RNA sequence: CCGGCCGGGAACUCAAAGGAGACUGCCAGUGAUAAACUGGAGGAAGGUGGGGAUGACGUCAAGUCAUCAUGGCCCUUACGACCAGGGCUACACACGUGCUACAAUGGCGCAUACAAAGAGAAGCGACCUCGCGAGAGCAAGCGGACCUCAUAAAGUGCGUCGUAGUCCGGAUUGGAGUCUGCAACUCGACUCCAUGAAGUCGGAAUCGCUAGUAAUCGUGGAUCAGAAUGCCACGGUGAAUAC
RNA sequence: AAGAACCUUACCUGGUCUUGACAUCCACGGAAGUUUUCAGAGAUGAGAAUGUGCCUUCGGGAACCGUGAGACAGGUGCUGC
């Protein structure tokens, strides 16, 4: 804000096996308050990418975070007249809030037979970066890298 | 030998008669699988009762209305907290400072003449 | 026995006369219940503070009814006849049955 | 205020107060499902119009007592929003205050 | 599956296959379905030509495709003809259930040209 | 779409229909109740529907049975 | 107009209702009828006695009627044929007996209303509106207040335009709702038009 | 007859009244030893605890002479009044605010659980019968912490749809049916038969929201003889970001 | 506008009236009230059977109903500049 230097808010750990960031995750994935259907699919797909790498349940999430996990982002501030863009870093909190927007929005769109489908689907080629999430992190950092001279 | 806890949650109100022994949920008359066994939310209840064990500690009789599934259930959670008094500060000294005693009633602000749902405003447009 | 309910809008006044009552009534017909507090009543109004355009512009009023049983447990002789007669302290709405 | 209405809306309360509610009959009863279905309530439901338009409840707007504002009234005070406020904020209606909660 | 209208579905479950023809919906095709014994989830390429014969002589009772097209066809004929205000609003191209003309009613007025 | 239980009239307009029934074909018979049915005797008179200003003479036809006169009687004139 | 009514905020606080009595929802309409009644006749009647306000009860099914005004004398008349008068043609409108009983105020320039009231008086006795207000709100304060300020609104003055003004001493804190407040608005009808007067007084601070 | 159904208690929630407490209360630091800011103890709540009502002097010569009263004007056998019907629902067409949606967190059908606050006597309206359903009839209780609205729905178990302008979606339209009401053509609501459109996320531009809020779901009330996707009110799951 | 089938309705046509639909007066006549027929879109008009006291000033009274002028009623008609 302006003055407020408040904080962010106090989420609950998951019920299902401890975890605060794919709680966030959920929490996000929730439209209408429909927590029920959205932690439904959220473990389906999960177990479903687990049993189909071997590995366990959030390791191969942050495996498939991880690589949609960006380094930089552009934005604009301008400086008496011509307005310009700005590659800059980004706090870890918002970078991988972002990065589970996208492997949202990879998932969502993309719809096969059902949302743990799609879900899985992104998680299983952003875990061997192959996807659509790792795509939208390729096009940050070629926003970024290029107007450099702007610092 | 039995102990009473209120609990109440968003408009939810419960009563819970705590006694040590077996660990089934009487709730409103049916068990914990049951009542919203199948559903998000299930541990909440049980989110304050595994600091100290609880599976061969103490039952519970409860009863619940009011709210709906997650405000009964925070409700029962309340009741919980309340009717641990036979286990006293001794361990509200870490269940406080892990919560789970504060009512954070957030309660439903009403809905205010002109807006959509208290904070919802119709669609405003210049032109 | 006598289902005694009585019924005001000012609680500073049902109060006040559901002692007085209940006190002539058990100093002589003993065995009450007490002045069961029977919740308040609202009965709301919302309406235009406008008589044009501006029907957002409005206002709420209310109005509390408040109740007292007193569930008087004997039909006294003391009670039957020292009852009746004194339906004072007006602005309230009484109802005894038998 | 239209006094030709208010006078209009008396004579429909009247008249209906009068005939309806008393000759019922007529409508309400022997339209039932019985023998009478023959030409008995055919010629029920004729003389139906033996009374006009008026002596209906359906008439009836209910107007205000003080100012005849058919809109804007409440079936309670009898009166319309104006002057309930009006009333109200002088303190002339028992147990009435602002609402806040 | 050569049944009244042109009922020609595959792999298809019975009343949403049925539906198809215009005539019968839903409720009707259901009705056939307990009147000739047929289930309500088996598809035509499981259906049996025994049944398929039921299915035919079932809906022969009710109004079929061309029937009720030219039922309805003569009915509104009728209306035009009559020159009630039904009529009327059927050939100035408006609707006759009374909804708004001013805005809405596009669908039945026309598109939104100019 | 409405009153299942038979048609409604108004004496006059039943006691022109009788009178012109016993008579014969008759001119025009002005009728205000648009909120009238028609019955099967009717069929070959010419009255005249009142729509708020004018009266609309139509010739009765027996498919113009369970209708009423609003319903040939326009009241909305457009262009 | 954009402000609150002081009498209305405050009843539900400090104030006493106008009209107190039970009725249930079926003859809550003809008994707020009737108490209409009764009270624009008795303003009709006695306008001239200068009535600050009237309290209206209804003991069981009888009506009963507090007159708070300043002169008891001209509303009763010698021997009280006038209070005789009164009750007869008030109970044959309201169908019940009515025990009418008047009350002296030996402070009547302290009443918003009596102090309309007299304001439009002499408006219609054609005083000045300046003299008439600074007037009105020296008699309050010279007999004793923590505060006024009155207000006039119309054609003070006569003139084409419409201007209103007003004029305060002392304090007076509305927004306060402990604050005991004295409000009535009169209006006053001349040649010219509708004069609105209103005046606040700032008589208890709890 | 396991229905607190009942004998039996004032244990408990709840209950209306009368009070306590939550006021920077105190401590550490910073701050010009001041104001004050930040963190912390206990505590449910910490600094205006949450929300609400409360609208400064006055501006826009803002809107209402149509709620009412009124300065003047004007009709005053009339610009007055009554009555049948019609109109406000009219339609080349442009715009604003809401519901439905435009689907697979799901349409879909069967079995399952959980709201608070209210209203209700020329009204709410048990049980029972029929009625696909409007709802019809007989006929208890209730002008009320009893009798009725009133079964709460999202949530969950089984599975069709397993991706198609499609079983998403319901408008247009005819016959036939119930109901409010003197009457349903203009011009009502409701339930069934037949129907399924555009619409596949929406262009520039633009609105609301920092918490129980939005989002979404359901319920009640006023208007009413009858007539909401609106208004008001209550509750349901329950976020996000804030550099 | 917290709710247009009539009404609501302030608009339109047609049929009506006039100190008038609405409050009051004098004088005159009838007591009201109740049932009923005819034409009309009805308003209204043409009617037919029933109906009498609360006080005796008791040449009548208190309401109720109708007739004549007048004062007037009446307007959702104008300017919210
Ligand atoms: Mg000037």
């Given at each position: 804000p302006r003055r407020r230097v408040i904080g962010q808010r106090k989420i609950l750990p998951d019920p299902k096996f401890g975890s605060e960031l794919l709680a966030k995750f959920v929490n996000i994935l929730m439209v209408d308050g429909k927590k029920s259907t959205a932690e439904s699919i959220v473990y389906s797909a999960l177990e479903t990418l687990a049993q189909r790498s071997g590995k366990s349940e959030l390791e191969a999430f942050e495996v498939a975070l991880e690589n949609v996990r960006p380094t930089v982002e552009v934005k604009s501030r301008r400086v008496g007249g011509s307005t310009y863009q700005v590659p800059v870093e980004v706090r870890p909190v918002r970078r991988n809030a972002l990065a589970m927007r996208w492997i949202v929005?990879?998932?969502?769109?993309?719809?096969?037979?059902?949302?743990?489908?799609?879900?899985?689907?992104?998680?299983?080629?952003?875990?061997?970066?192959?996807?659509?999430?790792?795509?939208?992190?390729?096009?940050?950092?070629?926003?970024?890298?290029?107007?450099?001279?702007?610092? | 030998n039995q102990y009473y806890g209120t609990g109440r949650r968003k408009s939810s109100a419960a009563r819970v008669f705590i006694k040590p022994g077996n660990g089934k949920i009487v709730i409103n008359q049916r068990s914990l699988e049951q009542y919203f066994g199948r559903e998000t939310a299930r541990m909440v209840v049980r989110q304050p009762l595994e600091l100290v064990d609880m599976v061969e500690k103490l039952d519970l009789y409860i009863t619940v209305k009011g709210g709906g599934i997650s405000g009964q259930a925070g409700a029962i959670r309340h009741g919980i907290t309340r009717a641990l008094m036979e286990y006293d500060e001794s361990l509200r000294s870490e269940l406080r400072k892990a919560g789970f005693v504060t009512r954070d009633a957030r309660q439903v602000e009403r809905k205010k003449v002109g807006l959509r749902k208290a904070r919802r405003r119709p669609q405003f447009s210049k032109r | 026995r006598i289902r005694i309910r009585l019924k005001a809008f000012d609680h500073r006044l049902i109060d006040q006369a559901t002692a007085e009552i209940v006190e002539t009534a058990k100093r002589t017909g003993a065995q009450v219940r007490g002045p069961i507090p029977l919740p308040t009543r609202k009965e709301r109004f919302t309406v235009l503070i406008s008589p044009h355009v501006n029907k957002d512009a409005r206002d709420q009023y209310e109005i509390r009814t408040h109740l007292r049983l007193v569930d008087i447990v004997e039909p006294t002789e003391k009670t039957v006849d020292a009852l009746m007669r004194l339906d004072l302290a007006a602005g309230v709405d009484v109802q005894i049955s038998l | 205020a239209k006094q030709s209405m208010k006078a209009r809306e008396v004579k429909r309360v009247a008249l209906a107060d009068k005939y309806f509610a008393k000759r019922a009959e007529l409508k309400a009863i022997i339209s039932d499902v019985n023998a009478a279905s023959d030409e008995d309530r055919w010629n029920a439901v004729l003389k139906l119009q033996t009374l006009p338009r008026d002596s209906s409840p359906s008439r009836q707007r209910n107007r205000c007592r003080q100012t005849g504002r058919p809109h804007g009234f409440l079936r309670k005070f009898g009166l319309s929003r104006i002057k309930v406020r009006e009333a109200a904020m002088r303190g002339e209606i028992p147990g009435l205050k602002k609402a806040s909660w | 599956a050569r049944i009244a209208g042109i009922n020609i579905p595959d792999h298809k479950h019975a009343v949403i296959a049925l539906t198809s023809i215009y005539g019968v919906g839903k409720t009707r095709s259901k009705a056939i379905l307990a009147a000739a014994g047929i289930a309500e989830d088996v598809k035509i390429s499981e259906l049996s030509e025994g049944q398929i014969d039921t299915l035919r002589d079932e809906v022969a009772k009710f109004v079929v495709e061309g029937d009720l097209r030219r039922e309805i066809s003569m009915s509104i004929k009728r209306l035009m003809d009559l020159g009630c205000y039904r009529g009327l609003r059927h050939r100035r191209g408006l609707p006759v259930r009374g909804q708004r003309t001013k805005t809405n009613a596009r669908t039945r007025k026309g598109p939104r040209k100019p | 779409r409405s009153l299942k239980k038979g048609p409604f009239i108004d004496l006059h307009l039943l006691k022109k229909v009788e009178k012109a029934v016993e008579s014969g074909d008759k001119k025009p018979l002005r009728t205000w109740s648009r909120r009238s049915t028609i019955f099967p005797n009717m069929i070959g008179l010419t009255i005249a529907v009142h729509n708020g200003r004018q009266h609309v003479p139509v010739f009765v036809t027996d498919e113009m049975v369970g209708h009423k006169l609003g319903e040939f009687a326009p009241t909305r004139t457009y262009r | 107009g954009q402000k609150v009514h002081p009498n209305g905020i405050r009843l539900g606080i400090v104030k006493p209702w106008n009209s107190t009595w039970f009725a249930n929802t079926k003859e809550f309409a003809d008994n707020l009828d009737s108490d209409f009644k009764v009270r624009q006749y008795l303003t009709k009647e006695l306008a001239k006695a200068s009535v600050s306000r009237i309290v209206i009860?209804?003991?069981?099914?009888?009506?009963?009627?507090?007159?708070?005004?300043?002169?008891?004398?001209?509303?009763?008349?010698?021997?009280?044929?006038?209070?005789?008068?009164?009750?007869?043609?008030?109970?044959?409108?309201?169908?019940?007996?009515?025990?009418?009983?008047?009350?002296?105020?030996?402070?009547?320039?302290?009443?918003?209303?009596?102090?309309?009231?007299?304001?439009?008086?002499?408006?219609?006795?054609?005083?000045?509106?300046?003299?008439?207000?600074?007037?009105?709100?020296?008699?309050?304060?010279?007999?004793?207040?923590?505060?006024?300020?009155?207000?006039?609104?119309?054609?003070?003055?006569?003139?084409?335009?419409?201007?209103?003004?007003?004029?305060?001493?002392?304090?007076?804190?509305?927004?306060?709702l402990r604050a005991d407040i004295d409000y009535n608005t009169s209006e006053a009808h001349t040649t010219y038009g509708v004069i609105g007067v209103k005046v606040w007084i700032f008589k208890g601070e709890i």
């Open positions: 929005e990879a998932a969502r769109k993309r719809g096969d037979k059902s949302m743990a489908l799609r879900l899985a689907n992104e998680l299983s080629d952003a875990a061997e970066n192959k996807g659509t999430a790792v795509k939208k992190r390729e096009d940050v950092h070629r926003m970024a890298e290029a107007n450099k001279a702007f610092a | - | - | - | - | - | 009860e209804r003991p069981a099914k009888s009506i009963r009627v507090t007159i708070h005004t300043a002169r008891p004398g001209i509303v009763i008349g010698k021997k009280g044929e006038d209070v005789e008068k009164l009750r007869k043609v008030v109970a044959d409108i309201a169908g019940v007996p009515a025990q009418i009983n008047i009350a002296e105020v030996r402070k009547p320039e302290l009443d918003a209303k009596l102090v309309a009231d007299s304001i439009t008086s002499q408006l219609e006795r054609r005083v000045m509106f300046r003299r008439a207000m600074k007037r009105a709100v020296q008699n309050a304060m010279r007999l004793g207040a923590k505060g006024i300020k009155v207000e006039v609104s119309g054609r003070l003055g006569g003139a084409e335009i419409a201007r209103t003004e007003w004029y305060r001493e002392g304090r007076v804190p509305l927004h306060t």
